[PDB]
Amino acid sequence: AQVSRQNYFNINYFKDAASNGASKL
Amino acid sequence: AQVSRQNYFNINYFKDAASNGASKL
Amino acid sequence: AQVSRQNYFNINYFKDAASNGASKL
Amino acid sequence: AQVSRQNYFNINYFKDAASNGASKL
Amino acid sequence: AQVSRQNYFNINYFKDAASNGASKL
Amino acid sequence: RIIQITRGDSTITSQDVANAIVAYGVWPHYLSSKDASAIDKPSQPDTSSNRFYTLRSVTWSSSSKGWWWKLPDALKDMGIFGENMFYHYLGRSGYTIHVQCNASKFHQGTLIVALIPEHQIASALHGNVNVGYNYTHPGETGREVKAETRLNPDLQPTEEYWLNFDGTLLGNITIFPHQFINLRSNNSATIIAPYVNAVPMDSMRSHNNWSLVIIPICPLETSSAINTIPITISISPMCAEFSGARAKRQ
Amino acid sequence: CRIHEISCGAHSTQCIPVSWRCDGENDCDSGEDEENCGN
Amino acid sequence: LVVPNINSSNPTTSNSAPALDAAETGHTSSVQPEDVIETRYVQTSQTRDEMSLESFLGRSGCIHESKLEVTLANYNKENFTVWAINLQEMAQIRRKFELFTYTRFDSEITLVPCISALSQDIGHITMQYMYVPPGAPVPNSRDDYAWQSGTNASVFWQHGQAYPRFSLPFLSVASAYYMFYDGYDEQDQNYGTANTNNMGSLCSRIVTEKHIHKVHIMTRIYHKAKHVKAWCPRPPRALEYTRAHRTNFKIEDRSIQTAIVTRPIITTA
Amino acid sequence: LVVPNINSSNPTTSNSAPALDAAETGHTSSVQPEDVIETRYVQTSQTRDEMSLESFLGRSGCIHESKLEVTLANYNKENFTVWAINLQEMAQIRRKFELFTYTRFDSEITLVPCISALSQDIGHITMQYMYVPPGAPVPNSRDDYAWQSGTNASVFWQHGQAYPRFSLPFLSVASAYYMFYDGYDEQDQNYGTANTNNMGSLCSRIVTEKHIHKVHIMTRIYHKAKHVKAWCPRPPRALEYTRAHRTNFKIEDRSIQTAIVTRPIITTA
Amino acid sequence: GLPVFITPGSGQFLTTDDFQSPCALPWYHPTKEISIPGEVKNLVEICQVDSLVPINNTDTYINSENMYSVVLQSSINAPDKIFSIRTDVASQPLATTLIGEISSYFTHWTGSLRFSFMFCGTANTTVKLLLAYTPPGIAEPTTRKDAMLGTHVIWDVGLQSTISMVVPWISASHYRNTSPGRSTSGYITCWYQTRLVIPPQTPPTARLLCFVSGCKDFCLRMARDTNLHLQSGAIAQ
Amino acid sequence: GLPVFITPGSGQFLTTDDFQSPCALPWYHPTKEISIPGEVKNLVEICQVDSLVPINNTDTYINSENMYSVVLQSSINAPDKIFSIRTDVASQPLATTLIGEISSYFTHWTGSLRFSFMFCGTANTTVKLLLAYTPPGIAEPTTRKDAMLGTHVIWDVGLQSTISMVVPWISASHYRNTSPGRSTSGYITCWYQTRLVIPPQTPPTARLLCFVSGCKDFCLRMARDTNLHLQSGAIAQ
Amino acid sequence: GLPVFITPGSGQFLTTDDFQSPCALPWYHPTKEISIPGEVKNLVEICQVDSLVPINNTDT
Ligand SMILES: CCCCCCCCCCCC(=O)O
Ligand SMILES: CCCCCCCCCCCC(=O)O
Numbered sequence A, B, C, D, E: 001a002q003v004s005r006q007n008y009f010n011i012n013y014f015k016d017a018a019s020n021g022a023s024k025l
Numbered sequence F: 001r002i003i004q005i006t007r008g009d010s011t012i013t014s015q016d017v018a019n020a021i022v023a024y025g026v027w028p029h030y031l032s033s034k035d036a037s038a039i040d041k042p043s044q045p046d047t048s049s050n051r052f053y054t055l056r057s058v059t060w061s062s063s064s065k066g067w068w069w070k071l072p073d074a075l076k077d078m079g080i081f082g083e084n085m086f087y088h089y090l091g092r093s094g095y096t097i098h099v100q101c102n103a104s105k106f107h108q109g110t111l112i113v114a115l116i117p118e119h120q121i122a123s124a125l126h127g128n129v130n131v132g133y134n135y136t137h138p139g140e141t142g143r144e145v146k147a148e149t150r151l152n153p154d155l156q157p158t159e160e161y162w163l164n165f166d167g168t169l170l171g172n173i174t175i176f177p178h179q180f181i182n183l184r185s186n187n188s189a190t191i192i193a194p195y196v197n198a199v200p201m202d203s204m205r206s207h208n209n210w211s212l213v214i215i216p217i218c219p220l221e222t223s224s225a226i227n228t229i230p231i232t233i234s235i236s237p238m239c240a241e242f243s244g245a246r247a248k249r250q
Numbered sequence G: 001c002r003i004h005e006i007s008c009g010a011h012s013t014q015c016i017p018v019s020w021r022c023d024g025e026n027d028c029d030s031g032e033d034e035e036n037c038g039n
Numbered sequence H, I: 001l002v003v004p005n006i007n008s009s010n011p012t013t014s015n016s017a018p019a020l021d022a023a024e025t026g027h028t029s030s031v032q033p034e035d036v037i038e039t040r041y042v043q044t045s046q047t048r049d050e051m052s053l054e055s056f057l058g059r060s061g062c063i064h065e066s067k068l069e070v071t072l073a074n075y076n077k078e079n080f081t082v083w084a085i086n087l088q089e090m091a092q093i094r095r096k097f098e099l100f101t102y103t104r105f106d107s108e109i110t111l112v113p114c115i116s117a118l119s120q121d122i123g124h125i126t127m128q129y130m131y132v133p134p135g136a137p138v139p140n141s142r143d144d145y146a147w148q149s150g151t152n153a154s155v156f157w158q159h160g161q162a163y164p165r166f167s168l169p170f171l172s173v174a175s176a177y178y179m180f181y182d183g184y185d186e187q188d189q190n191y192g193t194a195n196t197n198n199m200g201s202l203c204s205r206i207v208t209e210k211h212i213h214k215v216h217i218m219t220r221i222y223h224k225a226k227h228v229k230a231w232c233p234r235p236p237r238a239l240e241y242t243r244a245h246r247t248n249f250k251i252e253d254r255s256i257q258t259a260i261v262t263r264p265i266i267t268t269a
Numbered sequence J, K: 001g002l003p004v005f006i007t008p009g010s011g012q013f014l015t016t017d018d019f020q021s022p023c024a025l026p027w028y029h030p031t032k033e034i035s036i037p038g039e040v041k042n043l044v045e046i047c048q049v050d051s052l053v054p055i056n057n058t059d060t061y062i063n064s065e066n067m068y069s070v071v072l073q074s075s076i077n078a079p080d081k082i083f084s085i086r087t088d089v090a091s092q093p094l095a096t097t098l099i100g101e102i103s104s105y106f107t108h109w110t111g112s113l114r115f116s117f118m119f120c121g122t123a124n125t126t127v128k129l130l131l132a133y134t135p136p137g138i139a140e141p142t143t144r145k146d147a148m149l150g151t152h153v154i155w156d157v158g159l160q161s162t163i164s165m166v167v168p169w170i171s172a173s174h175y176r177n178t179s180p181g182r183s184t185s186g187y188i189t190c191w192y193q194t195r196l197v198i199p200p201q202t203p204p205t206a207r208l209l210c211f212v213s214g215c216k217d218f219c220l221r222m223a224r225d226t227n228l229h230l231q232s233g234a235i236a237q
Numbered sequence L: 001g002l003p004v005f006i007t008p009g010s011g012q013f014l015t016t017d018d019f020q021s022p023c024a025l026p027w028y029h030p031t032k033e034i035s036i037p038g039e040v041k042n043l044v045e046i047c048q049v050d051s052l053v054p055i056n057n058t059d060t
C-alpha cells in the first residue's frame, strides 16, 4: 500500500491500532 | 498475508510452530 | 519501482518530499 | 516461496549452496 | 529477480554499477 | 552587420555591431500570473518608461582601468521610470543596454562589456568593514576605477578591477552576459536582459538586480590627435512594472 | 558517608562528592557545600 | 547522458570559413574537431552523468565544527552552544555553490560527535541538538525551558549511538537561496547575502546532568545538497575567504595571492 | 491541502459595501483582498499541510525528567522513582495542547536514560520502567514484588541499548482528555483538571543488584501525540505556569508580566 | 538471516521522526468517540478569527482593557495621526493576538491580513477616519498625504459600527520570517479624515477597537517553538 | 521480528552515500519554484564557455589585465616564437581558466579543446600568425619548421577579429589525469607566419588575446576537491 | 519502523563475503572497454598449458 504527499510504501508491521504511524488528512 | 484488528502484514519468518507471534481470536 | 543506470529497486520509505534519495536526470 | 510445518516465507539470500538454511524432509 | 547456482533473490539496492555484488558466469 | 533598435519614442543605430546578445537567452516579459506574489494590479507605464535613457559619457584614455554602474538605481532620476521607482515599493524590469563608442580605423583597443547579476563587490579592507550604501549607489555617473584615497576607505569597495571586484578573476568574467568592443572591428555593443532574481519583484532602492561592468582589457593606443575617446551608455528598461503604490521615498 | 571523595556539607543528610564543594551550585541542603569559601 | 561522437572529416577547400569568427559577439565560437582537421571516426562512450549538478553538490561536506566545553560548576548555566546557520563558513563547500548566483535544494545534515575525554573516564554523555528558527526563543542555559522543544525540531545523540543525520526541505521565502546579494537593508545597511540567509540557528546542549568527568564535545556538521537546481554561473572564488556573507578578501598586511603560478618567459611553459 | 488563489479585481463603484460590517454579530467579517483593492491574479502553491493538527502536536516533546539517585546501602529499599503521569508539567508541551478545551489521541512515549557516573567506573546498569495504572500496587522498594510486572507493562533499558520507546492508546474513560475542568470532586474539592487526569503513575528502578559504583540515572521522557483531534480552541497561556492542573499564575512577590512589550507612544511602533 | 545493511542515522532519536512502535496496552479498545461540537483540524482555522489588538500598550494602559481601545477627540480639528503599528504578524503588538501568537510557532508566513475597526461612541457621534497600510521599503509616514499614497481605506462611521480593511500580502518573496529582523512589512497608520463630531450633551471622546485575522490568503510554515511565552524554574505537582 | 542480518559496512558514515533520511520539517511546503532565467544542469555547460587565458604570467604582468594579452611587434621580421603553453586543461596557465578551474574538481578528463584568438590592433594593421599544437611524446618545438609539422592552423587576420582552432584530444588512453605528473598533452606554440604590418601613423604593437573552451567532445570524471584554492585559518562570522 | 531481527554473524567482516556497498565515485563512467587480444575467464585455461618441468633439480 503506497501513496503521494507534498511514491512510497507503508503497511503497518504492528497489530495494535496505536502502534501505527502518523495519520493522513 | 495481512489483516484488520481493534492493515498490516505478517508472515512467519520462523520454521517452528512455537516461534510464531501471538495468536488471533 | 526499479530501473537502469551507468536493475535495482527503490521506493521511498519516507513520507516527506525531502526525505527522499538523490534525484535522477 | 512459503510453506507448512509441525505459513512462513524463506528464499535464500545467499548465492552458495551451503549458505542455505536447514533442510526439509 | 532470483536464480539457480552450484533459489534465492537478489536485486541491486544500489544505484551505481560498481555497488553491485559479485558477477555471474 | 548593422542594427536599429527602437524603444518608446527612441531609436538607436549602429553602422557596425557584433550581433547583440540576449541575457541568458530569455527575452524579457511581464510577471507570470503564476509566479506573482504582489496581489495588486501592477502598473505598466509602457512607452513612457520602457524607453531609451542615455547616461553620462565617461572618458576612456590610455590610462583608464575600468568603470561600472548598477541596475536599477543608475536610472533613478530618469523620467517616470525613476519616479515610479521610488513611489512604489516594488518593481521589476529587464533592460536593453546599448554601449556605444566610436573611434577610427587608426586606433586600437578593447573593452569587455559585461552585465552582472547580484553583483556583490568587496570593500577593499582587512576585517569587519562593509560597503556603504552611498557607494554602490552612484547614479548615472557610475564608479570610476580611481586609485587615490577615498573619504572613508572604511566603506569603500575595492578599486581592484582585474579581480572583478569580488575575488574572481577577470577573464573568467565571460561566464556572464558579455560582448567586446574592439574599435578595429565593432563600434558598439548591445545586451537585452530579462528580470533576473529569485523573486517576482524586489525593492527598486534596497537592491540592484544587475551591474554593468566595462574594462579596457586592451589599452587605447593611437597615433591620432584624439587619444581620449568617450564611451556613451544608453539603456532601455523593458516591461516596466511597479506594485505597492504609495508616497515617494527619499 | 565518606571514603575520601564523599563528605556532606552538613553534619547529617547524604554527601556531596568534591566538585560541588564550592562550585557555585547548591548540593548538601544546609547551604553548606557553599558556606563561606572566598579565597 | 552521452557525449556526441566524432565523425570522419575530409579535405575542405571551401569558400566557407567556420574557424574564423568574432568573440565580440559575446558568443563562444562554434567549431568542432572535424571542422579543422581530417579526423577519424570515433564512437564515444564517455559519460557526463557525474558532470551533473546533483552529482556535484550532491556530496556531503563539512560546514561547521561546534565545540562545546563541559564546565562542572555552573553546569546548569553554560554548557550550551549556538551557531547562526549558514554555509559561508567552510571554503571547500562555499566555493562550489559560490559557483552560481542562485541555488535551490533540500539539505541532508549529518552529524559527527567526538568526545575528547578529560578525566580518566567518559561516563555517559547525551547531547541535544535543537534547530532554532529565527524568532524562536534562544536557550540561555543548559536548562532553558526552550529544550522542551515542544514544536522545535531536536535530535538526540549519545555515546555509542551511530552518527545522527536528518533531512531538511529547502527553506527560504523565495524561490532560491541567494549565493550573492547586490543589495542592502530596509535600513541601507549590511550590503551582504547576510540580509536574507538568516536561517535561524543550531543549538546543542549536553543533557547528562551534573556529574564528575570534565570533557569536551566536538560535534562536526556535514551537509549534502539534494534535488538540485542552479542558475547564473559565476566565476569561481580566486583567493581565500575572509569573512562570511562578504566577498571581502584583502588581508591584514599580506600579498594579494591568487593561484596563478608565475613563469620566467611566455615562450616557454 | 491547498490555499485558494487570488483573483484579478476591478474598480468597484457598487451600491453594495462588503467591507462595512459589524463585529457585534460575534462573526469574523468576510472580506478578501480583491473586495477592497484592484488586485492581481495569483496562482497560489502555498500549503497548509504543516498547519494540520497532527502536524502540530504530532511532534515529540519532553514532559518529565525523572532523576534517580543510586544509594549503595539500603540498596533494596530505595533506589526507585515515581511519577504521577501528566503533561501539565513542562510548559512547551502543555501550552500547545492547552490551546484547546479537549483533545483525543494516542501517545508515543520515548525515553532517554542518562548515566552521570560517580565512581571512576559505570559498570553495568539496568533500568526498569513499569507503567502503573491507578489501582495497581505501587512499588515501595527496589525489590517490591510489584516489579514482577505479571500484568503491568514494563520496559527495560540498559547501558548501550538504544533509546527505548513505545506506543500508548488514548486512555481516559471519556471521549477526550480534558485540557481544563470547570468542576470539583464528589466531595466539592480540588477544582481542577486534577479530578480526572489521574492516569496512574510511572515507576523506574535499577535492576542491577547491589554493587560498587555510586551513580545517577537521568531518564528523560518524551511524547508525540498521534491520530489527533481537538475541539473548542482557547486563548493561549499568557504568562508562566505556576502549578499543574491549576490555571493559577500569581507568583510570590513578583509582577504580573505578560509578554506584551510596552512602547512610548501609539503614534510610533 | 536476510543480508541487511545499517544506515547512517540509525539508532538515533529524532523528536520529529515518524515510525511505528509496539503498543504497551495490547487488545485495548479506547472509549468510543462521540458527537462533540466545534472540532478543529488545522490551526489556520484559528488565525482566521478576529482577535483584539492590544493597540494602546503604553506603560500607561499596559495591564487593563484600556490598552485595547483608542480614544478620539471631538476637539481635534486636523490631519492628525492617531496610531500606527508594524505589520509582521508576530510584530508588536500584534504578536500577542491569536494569529500573532499562532504564527509565533512557525518560522515562515504569507498572506493578506484582515483588520477590522469598531467605533463605540454615542450613536449620534459621527466621524471619518483614514486606515492606511504603507508598503515597506520606506519608513513610517509622517503626514496624512505621505500615508494615503499607499494602500488605504477611508472609513465613514454611520450605522454599521465596524469596517474591515485588508493588508494585501505584498512581499518581494513568497513567505516571510515570523520573527523579523530589521526587515518590515510596512505599518498601519490611523488618521483623521474629518473630525469626530458630536451634538450638544455628548461625550467628547470615542473608543475605538481593532482586530486582526488572516485572509483566505494567509498561510504559515516551518514548525518551531513559541517565544511569546517561557518557563524559568519548575512547576509544582 | 523479521530474521535479518547485519552487513559489513553498516553504521558507517560515507560522505558520498545515498540514503533516505527523516525530515526535520514535516508537512513543510517549500516556496513554489519560479521562472528564473538561464538555469544550469550539468557543469560541462560551463567548460563549454570561453574563458580568457592568463597567457602572459611573468612576475611582470601578474596582477593586472596585461597578463591576458600578448604583444606583437611591427619591428619583428622573422620566424619568431611568441609564446607557448602546456595543454593539460589544469596545466598552467590554463588551470585558472573556467574550464581549467572546473576540471580541477575532477581527476579525469578527455576531449578536444577550442582555443580562440583575437587580434586587437588598428583596423589597418595586418598579420599572419601560425597556431600550432604539437602532440606530446616530444618536447617544445624550438623552430617554426619543428612546430608546423604537427597539427596547426595558419591564421590570417583581415576582418573577422577572432579565429578559433582546436586541440584534438589525442591520447594513448581514453581519459587523462586533471593533475598531470611529468606526462604532457603537448603544447601550443605561437609563431610569426608573416610580419605584423602597419601603415605610416600607426601603433607598432598589437594586443592579442586567447581563450579556451571544451568541444562537443570534452568530458570530465572522478569528482574530487579543488586545489586551485585553499583555506588556512578560519573565516569570520 | 519495520520490526526486524538481528542475526548471529551480523557486523562481522568476512574476507570472502559477497554484499553490495555504496560507491565512492557516483555518476562515474569507467573508460569504455576495448578489443584486447587473448583474454582469460577461468584459471583452468592455464593449467591446460604446457609448462616445462624442472626435472633435473640436483644442487648441480
Ligand atoms: C540545522 C542544520 C542547518 C543546515 C542549513 C542548510 C541551509 C543552507 C542555506 C544556505 C545559506 C548560505 O550559507 O548562504
Ligand atoms: C508511561 C507513559 C505516560 C504518558 C502519558 C500520556 C497521557 C497524556 C494525558 C494528558 C493528561 C494531562 O496532562 O492533562
Ligand SMILES: [Ca+2]
Pocket: G019, G020, G021, G022, G023, G024, G025, G026, G027, G028, G033, G034
Ligand atoms: Ca555545590
